[PDB]
Design an enzyme around this catalytic site. Structure first.
Site, PDB file in Angstrom:
ATOM      1  N   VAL A 184     -25.084   1.834  22.795  1.00  0.00           N
ATOM      2  CA  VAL A 184     -25.446   2.007  24.093  1.00  0.00           C
ATOM      3  C   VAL A 184     -26.063   3.467  24.271  1.00  0.00           C
ATOM      4  CG1 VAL A 184     -24.788   2.284  26.477  1.00  0.00           C
ATOM      5  CG2 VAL A 184     -23.268   0.802  24.908  1.00  0.00           C
ATOM      6  N   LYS A 185     -27.361   3.226  24.557  1.00  0.00           N
ATOM      7  CA  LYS A 185     -27.988   4.522  24.832  1.00  0.00           C
ATOM      8  C   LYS A 185     -28.009   5.103  26.533  1.00  0.00           C
ATOM      9  CE  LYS A 185     -32.685   4.823  22.316  1.00  0.00           C
ATOM     10  NZ  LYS A 185     -34.029   5.123  22.652  1.00  0.00           N
TER      11      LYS A 185
END
Ligand SMILES: O=P(O)(O)OC[C@H](O)CO
Ligand SMILES: O=P(O)(O)OC[C@H](O)CO
Ligand SMILES: O=P(O)(O)OC[C@H](O)CO
Ligand SMILES: O=P(O)(O)OC[C@H](O)CO
Lengths: 217, 223, 223, 217, 223, 223, 222, 222, 217
Positions: free
Chosen positions: D85-86
């Protein structure tokens, strides 16, 4: 590099001057009051030093206010052409330096402890600036690094104020000052007398004496 | 190194000038907005600073377009020979600097944040360039490094534009500027004040006073 | 540091010149051909650029042999005193540079990839040498290192050939060129425009204009 | 050093993956929306990439608020175990990283532009931190110097967060990243394909072919 | 690198803790004097900080004599296991640190201005040493250089005392601390706040938002 | 870094030990003789110092020949397990160090002026080597450079001899010794006291105590 | 750093060991013949050195061909487990070193003048490599720079061959060897003696003496 | 940086000068004898080189004694004002250089292998000094470091003797010479030719060609 | 860099001047009575050296007192205008140098072992200063480091005194002196002769010869 003697002891000054290695003298209120005891007056001490020493002689004002500094400065200046007025690095001091400089009275800004103070003194037109390296050493800071930065700053702007290394405690302050390129050092008598000496010089002299006896008893 | 005062406070300016240590003044619209309160007119503030400072006084245009910049610049210039027109680093700004330089109107290119912006302002003919070192510090980049690059670039091409270090926040910005060899620093009054001071100066003065009392109880130097 | 525009668009050129930051132009047949549109003659573009630009305009020779190169170079020279003839780093190219130098026709040696190539072109008498830094970056070699060595070599021998950094891809090629001391960079109009920009310049301008409105409601500077 | 492909173009990803030199993929909302046009849906693009790529695949949340980031993060995580997850470097982002990290969900902190931002992200427990070097280059600052300082800082404190160099524009960002010791680079397709190539390699191959024909036509 | 908050402001402390980025707090008599106004008791402020911060909380003794220092230290220690007793760099201070260390009471030696003072505090057994970098900056010496020497000295002798950089004024004190490898920085709230921010982060977020709108008009990520 | 007191005053020693920063003592017949006053026996001073000090106490041999040195060293050893026998860098001194090392009597090689002398003493088995840095400064050579080379030499060969910096004259000998990584410095009680002091420590303390009084009139910290 | 004495003189060796400062000895036919005097045979001198020195003693071969060198080396080994055979940096020398190392005979490769020659001797299994720094100085190149490079190279590969600095001419070769981290230096007895001396030491001793006469007139500490 | 061609071949010299890249020539008896072929005498080759080259041409003496060297040198000078006499770094060589310099005959001191030899030749008045860097490389020392030291030394004293790098083996000797600031390099014609080449230049030319065919198919710019 | 020979042998001198590399001679109490054997007046050799050498010849005063030093120096000066008077680094010596300088008699201050001694000699007006580098090497300090500091100091203050490196023991003292920029070295004859030699020069000469016999028997 010029070498000044940092004392108000007239005996030390006479001896130093007789060696021919002393180019000037610096005094300050502590040095003078150490000599002005048991009858001797400070006005006499100052005059005697001025007479004895050919080169610059710095003598410090004691007033903390502009008008008082400038009036003490002019009395100091009037004592002889080699007199240099020492002025502390304060707001009133910078004002006084600027006025004295415009009147072509030579000045020496003292109690300088970082390179920007020295630059301010130069901008006021001071003849000498005197950073106190040994008192920086006393508080755990390598005082000679300040001399190195002042030399760089002065070189950058082609400043004509002379860097006068003061509060010198040992011959390595003197060596580093010369390597950096400081204009002047002022040294206490016990340091001065050591600068000419080295044990290999002594040893070499003895050897040459020996060898010469072998061809002329 | 010249030292300018970065303020539009007239009291600060009069005091600093009297120390003999202030070579000019920089203002900007924020600094002037701060003083132009409670009936005080920005026009009066600007004229008064110009009147009482002998060195350069930078006053910033507010138009964002070329023609408005040059029209305001010519007015600023008209107020006194010591007025320097501050112009922001923008396309219109560079155009304005080129025109004004050809008219022999002194200029100061402001809001510079990297060395190439500084070079472009120099190529346009600007008199001063003002990199904002503290605002670079604010965003986690050591702003004094940009001053070092500008000095190197200017030295390489013998550029006559003066480097004017701005957004100064502390005495180490000042020290580093002098060691690098910047032409000018412009500083806030509290920074200016601190530059003269050092605890060992205070301490040394006290000791000299005390010792002198031993041979002169009224602390005078009678020659 | 001089800045050339790597373009044949007359509007780009006029605009960069008004910014006071463009000193010349480098063209090639592709750039010129691009502009020959809506009826425009190839040669009219080139002659127009030579007329308008006060300063150097590089034009490529397409012949690969000595006699063809010098005959083309002479034609190009005849189009304007500021035309500069681009000649590649080859055996025949060096012979052509030597001949043209004697005829006082200015030259620009292209496709230079190491410092000794740059030195040979300088020894033949070339006016500019153009190392293609981005094409070295393309093959995993830091192209700016070659510019640094050429600057040192040229300084050692007081060589008057100008170092013209080419194949520029980003603003750090430009920054490094200036810090090294390269004489010229040539850049596309869009790299050129980016060189003026910084987010803190925009942020700062916006804040100054906000603060000014507190003292002057319609944004004006009346003096 | 790991090498990731920085694109949402499935054709580029397939090609890169077929070369065997791609270790992972990074995406971002701009990259995805460039592909999600003329009928193609972003949810399909993301799923296809996750399926194609064995290694880490970064996909960015778009909510700017803590609760929304964490809920988007968990949907992202649920798409497959290789999902990362960015999360942008903001106050809400740091909070989200800390929560996701405690839930053992891998995270990538993006839009980092100086070394202290990267350190904050590491302190929040982030798996990767992604400084954008090309966007620093864009504004006249050598972006690789930030990677060098982050590497030093991370080494000083034995930080396990991986340095993931992003916004890469040329092969010299990649070379300098490897010399510095960055853990990962993510590169656009046009840069990726150039890394294997060199003109002396091409020349050498031709020479060996020639010479071999002299002993086997 | 641990990050402490240098404040006695409870609102600032609660906010910073909630960012997850604050590992402890430092107070000093000035900071507490600032908050202990309008009826607020210093005793309540101290207990509340201890109560709500999980990491170390430094509280400074006010006695200048050994026996008063240790008596106050034992009281501070008694208020919570996370309390760290701040002791100034003085003769009595070193005596107090030696005694308190032998009692397994965590200590923080403050008002350190050179590397040898820091070493003496370490030899006495102190848990943290706190050099005041901004106050060195104030007197024209780059304070971060003292941090670099302390780090080298501590590394030489495998000293376990933590270097806690104090009197921080800007984000570059923080950056330089991390690059040097200081154990801890303690920062004011406004500095803390600025550490997360960068104009290109803001700009990048805006651009991502805009581009995402093209494929999702309500700016959501529906998976 | 260990700190030895270069003294025979028991009060100095007790005081430095309470500061937690004194690890041992170096004596010589002049220092001891100084304390033999108001009836005090020379040997009683030495035996008292050996009894009280938990750690090393250096005592000089006065014989200049091998047999005299080892016979004296044995006597000295018999006065306390922590006695360390000081032996000069001479031919007979090295023979004596080798013999005493075999007998597990600790030794300190004095009058060391270059790094190879220090290495020879380490090879003979000496416990400490004492380079006299201030006596090198006296003759225009920076004595700290010899300490730096000895540290490098000793690190190269994992030598267990401790470097004991002697003839210390100022706090920068001490600072440099610590940054280099010397094992021990020996200093006079007055250099030792100066090492704790800084004008900003005093200034800071005074301000904290002023501010505390605003919240606690009688200076107290009640918790 | 180990210090070997470059000599065959037994009184010089005893006086060095008693200082605690000598770790071994390096000989050569000239040194040995110098002592092969007044009844003493060449073999005798070497056997007595091998017997009295608790450490390495380097003894040279005079054969310049592989077979002759290896035959001599075996003889030398037979004389004592602490004998070390000197072999010159040549093709036949490297062959000899390889063979001797496989037979656990210790070796010392001499006439080394650049760092790659030193590396080749190490790779052949040599116990010591002896670069001749003073003879590089003689031809106007700073010989200690070769020691520095050999140290780097040996550190890179964790080479256990000892660097033995030879052809030492002054105390600065010795100082630089130690600062670089050379394993051993070999020096003449006189250079060795000079290493202990400094004029400030002599001055210090004299000062100690006078000040002691102040606290007690006789000159004896009780 | 001046570039001399190390050759006696006249077509090689013409082709180099036409590139604008050759400033002079260095010969030696082997080079010259190589061309003394098919009717051509040794003297002829040298006279034709002296005549066609607008710059220095170095010609060696074979006598190793002072009188013989000086006699030859005078002959060589007689052949043209641009002849330069090569003299080896020896006692008699230095004597010869002093004498010849006083007679305004230009000289080139060869077989220099350290910086002090270079300084001695300068002090004797030599026009060029030629250190042989490749032969230092042959013995495992980096020959270009000697060039660097000679450059420093000559700069210190404002020496007007030109540093002429010789025994060049590759384009990196040439690059380093230029970066250091050597006055001249002498190279074989083939090394010279290699200096112009780079694979990205070839690639660039090919790209230029194809893109030009796009704007105009024939291949000619009008 | 000038090269002096430390000798009083006229053959050695003529040989070195013939080489074109000897610029002068230094003659100390420990050389002249070497050559005063079987026929020659420690004064015919000196007078002849003075006649031969078209450059400085240093001759040492043996008195240790100021008055004897200046009287001897004036005698030495009388022997030849190229005579340079060697004076030790002592109090009396500095005084003598100052007097002799004012009389335009050239001087050479010997037994210098640190840079501040050299500076004091220069301040007295000395023509040369001679630090004894080998005697520093003898006591375990690198004597060339002193030469390097004196060069810096003299450059800083534009000092015209020449640095004359003495007590030279090997060709590396000479190489380092030249790289530093010392004005002069003084070397014994055997060091001087070794300065021209190199094994590759010899190898080279043999090859010139061999190949020449191929082309012309
Ligand atoms: O008092 P000090 O020693 O700091 O020195 C001041 C006069 O230079
Ligand atoms: O402190 P700043 O950033 O407002 O700077 C103002 C320009 O000197
Ligand atoms: O958009 P760029 O090129 O700055 O790169 C961002 C993705 O790494
Ligand atoms: O900013 P200062 O100097 O008050 O510092 C407070 C200690 O962190």
């Amino acid at each position: 590099m010029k070498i000044f003697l940092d004392t108000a002891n007239i005996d030390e000054i006479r001896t130093g001057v007789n060696w021919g290695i002393v180019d000037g003298v610096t005094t300050n209120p502590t040095l003078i009051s150490k000599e002005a005891v048991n009858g001797k007056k400070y006005g006499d001490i100052i005059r005697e030093i001025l007479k004895i020493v050919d080169g610059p002689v710095s003598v410090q004002v004691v007033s903390t206010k502009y008008e008082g500094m400038v009036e003490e400065a002019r009395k100091i200046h009037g004592l002889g052409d080699n007199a240099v007025v020492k002025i502390p690095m304060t707001e009133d001091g910078l004002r006084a330096i600027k006025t004295l400089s415009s009147e072509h009275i030579n000045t020496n800004c003292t109690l300088v402890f970082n390179p920007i103070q020295a630059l301010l003194a130069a901008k006021a037109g001071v003849t000498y600036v005197s950073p106190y390296v040994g008192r920086l050493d006393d508080i755990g800071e390598d005082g000679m690094q300040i001399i190195d930065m002042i030399r760089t700053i002065f070189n950058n702007y082609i400043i004509k104020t002379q860097i006068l290394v003061a509060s010198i405690r040992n011959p390595i302050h003197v060596l580093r000052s010369a390597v950096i390129g400081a204009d002047v050092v002022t040294v206490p008598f016990n340091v001065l007398k050591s600068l000419m000496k080295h044990p290999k010089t002594d040893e070499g002299l003895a050897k040459f004496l020996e060898d010469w006896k072998k061809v002329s008893p």
